[PDB]
Design a protein around this ligand. Structure first.
Ligand SMILES: CC(C)[C@H](Nc1ncnc2[nH]c(C(=O)N[C@@H]3CCN(C)C3)cc12)c1ccc2c(c1)S(=O)(=O)CCC2
Length: 168
């Protein structure tokens, strides 16, 4: 169960690995995988598109049905849906998209959703094309998450910069 391997322990509850979250989910079979979602759960590209493709679009159909009944999420919010073949559950979390003018302060609310789950496999929220400074996102994660989080960051260059930043 939750067979995470090759992670570097940063704090007593935050671990990090240079890895593709999709490959990690297939191997580890975590209780929860976090999706870096948008408010309409449209998994069009990046991490969300990669996780949806790994479910052969089952995540997208389920997401459309959730939105029809419940309406969109708020920025900083989340919902729990099926993990499909990747996990028992997927926690869809909306971090702020700084490139589209959303407030970076909502990154704390986004990470706070992780605290309702004992163990999670997750990406670095609001990084990549969402525009947040990835060293800042790691600092918010470490300061906010209290449950056990395994971060998969699919870029060795960024991984090395994040670990060097944490260890200063
Ligand atoms: C910073 C970046 C390295 C990181 N990327 C990732 N981090 C962790 N696991 C990842 N898998 C893939 C991928 O494409 N998986 C594919 C499956 C099959 N393919 C071989 C490859 C990307 C990726 C990341 C972190 C957060 C966010 C983004 C990107 S974003 O999608 O630009 C906007 C939402 C927030």
């Amino acid at each position: 169960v939750n067979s995470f391997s090759g992670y570097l322990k940063l704090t007593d509850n935050v671990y990090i690995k240079n890895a593709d979250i999709v490959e990690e989910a297939k191997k580890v079979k975590p209780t929860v995988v976090v999706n870096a979602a948008n408010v309409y759960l449209k998994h069009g590209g990046g991490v969300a598109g990669a996780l949806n493709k790994a479910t052969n679009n089952a995540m997208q159909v389920e997401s459309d049905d959730y939105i029809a009944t419940n309406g969109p999420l708020k920025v900083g919010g989340s919902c729990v849906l099926s993990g499909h073949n990747l996990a028992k559950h997927c926690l869809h979390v909306v971090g702020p998209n700084v490139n589209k003018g959303e407030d970076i302060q909502l990154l704390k609310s986004a990470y706070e959703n992780f605290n309702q789950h004992e163990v999670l496999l997750a990406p670095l929220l609001s990084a990549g094309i969402f525009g947040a400074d990835p060293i800042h996102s790691l600092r918010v994660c470490v300061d906010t998450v209290r449950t056990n989080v395994y971060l998969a960051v699919f870029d060795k260059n960024l991984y090395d910069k994040l670990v060097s930043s944490f260890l200063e």
